[PDB]
Design a binder for this molecule. Sequence first.
Ligand SMILES: *[C@@H]1O[C@H](CO)[C@@H](O[C@@H]2O[C@H](CO)[C@@H](O[C@@H]3O[C@H](CO)[C@@H](O)[C@H](O)[C@@H]3O)[C@H](O)[C@H]2NC(C)=O)[C@H](O)[C@H]1NC(C)=O
Ligand SMILES: *[C@@H]1O[C@H](CO)[C@@H](O[C@@H]2O[C@H](CO)[C@@H](O[C@@H]3O[C@H](CO)[C@@H](O)[C@H](O)[C@@H]3O)[C@H](O)[C@H]2NC(C)=O)[C@H](O)[C@H]1NC(C)=O
Lengths: 186, 185, 185, 186, 185, 186, 142, 141, 142, 141, 142, 141
Amino acid sequence: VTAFLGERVTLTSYWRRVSLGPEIEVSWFKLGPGEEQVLIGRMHHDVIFIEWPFRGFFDIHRSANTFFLVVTAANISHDGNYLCRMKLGETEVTKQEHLSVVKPLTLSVHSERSQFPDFSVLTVTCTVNAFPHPHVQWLMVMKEKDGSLSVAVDLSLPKPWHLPVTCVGKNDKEEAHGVYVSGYLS
Amino acid sequence: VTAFLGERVTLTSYWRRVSLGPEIEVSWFKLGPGEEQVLIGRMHHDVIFIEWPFRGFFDIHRSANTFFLVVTAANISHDGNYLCRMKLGETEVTKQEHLSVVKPLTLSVHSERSQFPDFSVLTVTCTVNAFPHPHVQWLMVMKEKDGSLSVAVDLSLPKPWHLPVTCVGKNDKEEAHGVYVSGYL
Amino acid sequence: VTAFLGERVTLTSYWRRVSLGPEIEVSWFKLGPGEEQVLIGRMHHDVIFIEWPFRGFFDIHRSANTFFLVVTAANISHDGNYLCRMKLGETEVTKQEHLSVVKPLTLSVHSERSQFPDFSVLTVTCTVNAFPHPHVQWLMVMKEKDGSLSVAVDLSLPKPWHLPVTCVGKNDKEEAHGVYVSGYL
Amino acid sequence: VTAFLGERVTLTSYWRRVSLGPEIEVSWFKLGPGEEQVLIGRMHHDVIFIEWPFRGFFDIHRSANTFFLVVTAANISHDGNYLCRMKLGETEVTKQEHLSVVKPLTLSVHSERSQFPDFSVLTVTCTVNAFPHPHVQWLMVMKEKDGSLSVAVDLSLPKPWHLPVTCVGKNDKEEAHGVYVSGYLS
Amino acid sequence: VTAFLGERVTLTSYWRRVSLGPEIEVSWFKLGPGEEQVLIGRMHHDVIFIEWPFRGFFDIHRSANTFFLVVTAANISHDGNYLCRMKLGETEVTKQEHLSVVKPLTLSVHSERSQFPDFSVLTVTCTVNAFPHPHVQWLMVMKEKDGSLSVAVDLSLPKPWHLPVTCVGKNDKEEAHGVYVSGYL
Amino acid sequence: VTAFLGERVTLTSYWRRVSLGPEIEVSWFKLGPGEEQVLIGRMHHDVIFIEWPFRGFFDIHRSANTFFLVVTAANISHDGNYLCRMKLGETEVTKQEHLSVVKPLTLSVHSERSQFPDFSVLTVTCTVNAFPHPHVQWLMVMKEKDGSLSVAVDLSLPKPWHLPVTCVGKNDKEEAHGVYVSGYLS
Amino acid sequence: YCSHMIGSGHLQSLQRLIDSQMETSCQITFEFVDQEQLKDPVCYLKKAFLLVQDIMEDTMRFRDNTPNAIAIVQLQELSLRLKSCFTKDYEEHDKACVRTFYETPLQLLEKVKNVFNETKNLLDKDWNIFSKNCNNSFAECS
Amino acid sequence: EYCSHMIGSGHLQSLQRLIDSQMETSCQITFEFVDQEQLKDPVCYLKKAFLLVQDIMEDTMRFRDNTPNAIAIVQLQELSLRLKSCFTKDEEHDKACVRTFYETPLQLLEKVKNVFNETKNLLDKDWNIFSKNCNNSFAEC
Amino acid sequence: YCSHMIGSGHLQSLQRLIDSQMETSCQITFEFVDQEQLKDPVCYLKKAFLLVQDIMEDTMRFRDNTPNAIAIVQLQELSLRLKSCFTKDYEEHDKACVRTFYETPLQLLEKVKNVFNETKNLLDKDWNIFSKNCNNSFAECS
Amino acid sequence: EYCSHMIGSGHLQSLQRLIDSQMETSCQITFEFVDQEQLKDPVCYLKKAFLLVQDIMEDTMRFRDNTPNAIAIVQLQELSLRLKSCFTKDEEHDKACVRTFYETPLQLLEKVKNVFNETKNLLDKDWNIFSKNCNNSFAEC
Amino acid sequence: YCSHMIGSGHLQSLQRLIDSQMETSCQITFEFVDQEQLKDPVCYLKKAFLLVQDIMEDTMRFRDNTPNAIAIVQLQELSLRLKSCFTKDYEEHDKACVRTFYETPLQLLEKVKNVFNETKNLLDKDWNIFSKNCNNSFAECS
Amino acid sequence: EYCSHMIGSGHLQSLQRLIDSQMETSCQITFEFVDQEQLKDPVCYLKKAFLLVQDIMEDTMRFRDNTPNAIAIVQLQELSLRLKSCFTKDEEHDKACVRTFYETPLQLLEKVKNVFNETKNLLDKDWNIFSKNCNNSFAEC
Ligand SMILES: *[C@@H]1O[C@H](CO)[C@@H](O[C@@H]2O[C@H](CO)[C@@H](O[C@@H]3O[C@H](CO)[C@@H](O)[C@H](O)[C@@H]3O)[C@H](O)[C@H]2NC(C)=O)[C@H](O)[C@H]1NC(C)=O
Ligand SMILES: *[C@@H]1O[C@H](CO)[C@@H](O[C@@H]2O[C@H](CO)[C@@H](O[C@@H]3O[C@H](CO)[C@@H](O)[C@H](O)[C@@H]3O)[C@H](O)[C@H]2NC(C)=O)[C@H](O)[C@H]1NC(C)=O
């Protein structure tokens, strides 16, 4: 599924035979790099136990034959693939889900004028912070602590400044513009 | 005069008669509210001394009948009125100048979708941090550490989301636009 | 219900009629003293939103006419009364549950010999840190950061030291003993 | 001698000929590893001087022919052998003392129940902190900042819990017991 | 008695009759202002116990009818009056001693030339940090962390600078001189 | 020139032809080690710009044909040689100046008596902190954070103390004395 | 005359409800008599029965005019009569000796059937049985 | 020709008898079924829906053996076993066009009833209807 | 009669002052009419002229009894007469439409000459020109 | 003999006419000149001062071409060109004994006038005066 | 008549006490006249002597009925007489010109002997010697 | 036989004369002696105690030469020199069974007096008493 930053999100799985729910030994995993499988939590007969690392970030609960892996609050780290393995006796069944996390882009524009040799060259700056794919462009990459990605671009305008000038920022299909119209002084 | 943040700036005062420069006892002040005086520095016969509080932030130098007050690098604190006291014997003349410091506005746009009762209400946010007069409004005040003023505004869009939407931010005459065109989903 | 420290726990509420589950506007609260209400989270038509203060500590999920409040990992703070407000149109029903959190008691024994006026008086110490009701007594209150309660008791033995001596500690029904058998010298 | 943690303790030495006291050049030492001799302090004609390292921790004073090395407050570091060297002119005499420091043991018991797959397996823990020789045992090693030694042991009890259960802790001849009698719930 | 900073020091008290030493219940106090009593330590039958606050700073030991209070290393705090209470049965005798701690004075000289209105006035500075009574004066109070007292004095010399100039610093009877002979320029 | 610590000081340069001032492209430099040239600031047509490193520590201004490099407040680091390069068109002229920084010396004297074997040996100490050349001497090197130089000397006096005793401190041509006259006790 | 107030045909319909419901993991919350707290065989049933009737309205529900929906209305009609074979005790004890269960609907029906079956059985022996003032036996519950 | 007369009116009735019988609750369950939005053509929708219904009944609809409803299911599976011949098969698109529904059992039975009823009505109209190979329609999913 | 109040000999002396001053980078601060704020050609001059006279005393100075010092006193004498060819306007506006310049002395003199030259020119056309109440045109300045 | 009659009284006058003409201001400028304190001998002071004055006028004293003052400068440079013969030269000490003065133009012209006037008076007294080689005096600097 | 108040036999016994005590490092605290503060030879002794008597009771002690214990009682008896050969001065000065010493018992006895020996010597010369009002000489001490 | 008549009554008296003479004080000193608790047998206790007393007097009891007490000590050492023959020796257990006492000189003299007095009385009873070799008793220490 797709979910935004900080939002609650749920991945689901279930047992074919509707007669059985608690009898199923459910266990969710977190697919790290290299097909690594990090055990998030387990459930069986309504006795749930989350591994301490994920504790508070993930929870499991059931309703009939359906099993839910609830993300209390999503962060960029959580973007990836998850795995639910259900077992009744010796037979097992598996379901795979891809949770794509998104951080709505933040397009910021600002300028500052040259201090030498004169005060004629104005340089506007367009900076766009988003996830997973930020992109900035004038019409004529750093990692954040959040796990997001910031990227920025500069434009130099000799006087006469040919304002207005537009920069286009976007996160895949998401998009926004920033237009510097006029300076403070003239 | 007017100057931007970080830039070098100079206020000037002068003696009426062009005959005298060094003889004048120049002294500059920083006018707090109530037109209260805080001594920045003094000059006389080309011997200058800046008070240690303002040392490195302000300097004084002379050319003929003119007297310069140099702001090495201006910050928001400096915005205000300055007063020069020029004394020669029993006569004293005062000249007043106004330094307006400006921080180029920074317009930012960012959105979020409601998490309750549903995911249908998109609230886009327009934030403008400038000085001295930031302003934001949608087309349809917090104080920072640097001394500037941040202000923001939210616009709620029920489904279907009528996009594009434009927000107009500006700092007095300075101005810029922000347009949210489309969501990610 | 009753649950130990760190464990996962669930309080439940439900709608009287089994016909309706999603339609009910569920909302859970944390009852401070004076039966004051602090909003934990809400649920409606399976759209859940927990307030940021309780985010990660509490969750809400539904099954049929039942409504669960999940405590991810319980701490002493959580001990108290909880209240569920279920609203359907003009009618509203309230159900109240009590979560008793428990910290397994930790009984410790330790001794010291008097340093004045002589080294003849042995004072053995029995310390029991538990919750909610630690208790210590010899056979013949301080608050911690985790929110638990430590209590201790001293027993003085003049020479000759009559050993063994037993101290009985307990947390309500939970119980353990500590016995000092002999000194080092 | 033997002294407990934090207590004041005194090692002594003296000069055979009772006529002389101040005339004797007294000097106490601290036997480090490898027969190392760390000068603690000196005394002669009632002029005492403690090396700055030991300053406040050790003091020297005299009464007639007897010389005293006073430990203001003992710590685990002080456990070891000391040396008093007395000299009159060219002839010297030496006395050796062993100060054994002791930290009364602290026996602590506590339990916690399994959180998965059920809540049936109760694990009691017996921890004993003492010096110099802590030892823990159920009836069916870490170093502290004090310089003491902590050691602990666990016991797993499947339901039915065969309580009561006893653990025996002791510091050489010192000894104490810890018995878990009943749980909070049943 | 009198002793310098950091040095070892001993105050003494004694019993009138030479027959008795151990039998006497000795106890030393530190007299704060108002002759208020703060217990340092006790001794009886050669069993000593110092209160934990003074532990390591003070010790008590006996020789015959004499009773010693040993200051391991003296600091300014220790300067003041001390009181020994010796009790035998129903009789009690008190003996009082005064410990004067001294910090050797540190005389320092340093100069600066005026920066306004000209560079013609040389101001030499004489600083003396001692205890208990620092004193400075030119020949023509601040408290430190260690507990000592710093004091200084300035001497202004218009051009031409009449050098040498001598400043006399002293701590009661202790004394030292500082002489500025010539400038760098 | 010569200037003391913390004082305001000015190095100057000028253009031969008195007709021209603003037209000249002035630029001051800081001669680091190895004939290195660190650009302090520039000026042309009364548009001044100081490199951010030196910002606040140095400033440039003009009066007619003369150009000034003002040191707001001098520190020991500033001691060295500076360079002013003036250019009109393709022709250039250079001027060189040596700013010698000085920290007025601070002569301090103090004593402490032996604590063993007796209290008879008094050791007076003479310490002189100055710049650039501190020097201490009794009549019978460490670097500070300021960039200054501290140096000190000790003198041991067996009783009878032959007081008074004098120590001579000096910074090149600057000079001062410290005399210990009498002890506190006798 | 209360011994044959509960017809055999009633248990027949209830068995059908059970054997006509779908088997699943589904589970719900419903009120019911706390068996452990109230152990007296007679008062337990008297209370269990009265409780089932309030529960039945909103718990056991079917589409209007279906065979099962009719079965339910018949069970309610049956109670309106039985209202006489029981004596009022006290109002404090309503919601006393009662607890809550989170279990499958089939397990509920099994409880309801069991309650009707045993109730009928006891009535056959003595029709005066449920005139007992159980107030005292209700008091122990908490 | 023979397909028209297979799905008896009696079969639809029994399905309704199961539905009318079910007890109403908030209970919801997860089951596999054809995504109506993903594949919108009505004729092909019934075609695929059917193949799922056969695997569905085994795991989804369960009753105590020999009850009127348990027997009712057996009559439907038998009916389905012979019916497979009246349908042309296009198996690669299995696991495609299937979506999971979290819905009440009644909503399920209503979906199954809807399928059988729509089927019967459509078959009556045309016995030759199901010659189409909607492999292309499956690709749309 | 004001048309020939300003003699040609006056501009001659002023030109000499200019062509007799030394060329340097030197620069000073002096008051003068803000040209941008006050654009009206007639009122600009009327104000520019009156301003030059106050400025002249302390701005344009020479050693006493020198050819140039005399030239200055002659220019002042000239004004004492012109005081009649001008009408008083208002006192608020003194120091209105005035700004400050930091420029070389030669550039100042060029401004002064320019002001005298244009002033004389306008007077030649109409001697009644500077009787205008420019109060309204002064008001725009700030 | 011929040196005595070169520096005309008329030349000193014109220099004064330039000085009297200059406008009085606080303005100050930096120019090269002989350090009077560094080299105190009056006879040698004029000797060196002169060599600087020739390079000085070019950069220091400037007037619009053909003005009474611009022409006045030309008369002084020409005068100086021929005068160099009446002076003995000792060039190594160039850049030595020269100091920079930050002073008003009037103070400068006064220094130049002082030099020419002192020169004329001294030459009148002795035409043979400037045979001295003060190389030693320069070393004193 | 005071010249022969102190018998020679008294010093004989004191010498025995000294030559009959054991030599050790042992040291005690006792009061005694500050020799430096009170330097006057006559008043120093007068005060030293009176002081020794108070000191003697609790300082110089022996087993009852021993040769030395008797020697002590004899010295006390001797004083009871001498009480007349001395004149009262003032009470302020008791505990003035007195200090404390921490030294061996033998060193104390040497001081006591020395005090008795010199005292006897001075009395032999003049029996009226210790009638002096030393109040003034006591005042200097501190 | 001859051992019985060595320790004279007169010797015990002189020891008492030293004790009676000593001045009473709080003063305490450290000296070596036999640990009574460590070795409890009375006969062997005197046996070992004696060997220490001989080394003891030299360092412990000191008086100015030729005083009644200094001479008294000499009479005791001489007495001891000849006495060593009346005792059998078992030297390895030297440094064993000896403990340090921090006690007043009077307590010491009382210990020494006690030894000589107990000795005399025991010798009088039996001159052959000290044939025992308590090496075993020393091992008990
Ligand atoms: C903007 O410019 C102003 C000055 O116009 C700055 O304020 C001044 O900041 C300096 C230090 O940055 C202050 O001096 C300091 O004094 C403390 C002791 O109180 C001392 O420890 C420091 O070393 C330093 O000397 C000064 O007092 C302060 N205010 C004034 C009026 O002088 C300000 O920091 C600049 N930046 C901003 C963001 O405002
Ligand atoms: C026991 O559980 C309670 C929650 O039931 C914990 O109390 C909560 O702790 C969190 C952080 O641990 C608090 O939120 C914090 O807010 C601050 C700003 O005020 C922010 O900087 C942090 O990042 C964090 O978001 C929360 O306010 C607090 N209380 C409540 C009622 O929510 C508690 O920490 C747990 N542990 C213990 C030992 O009590």
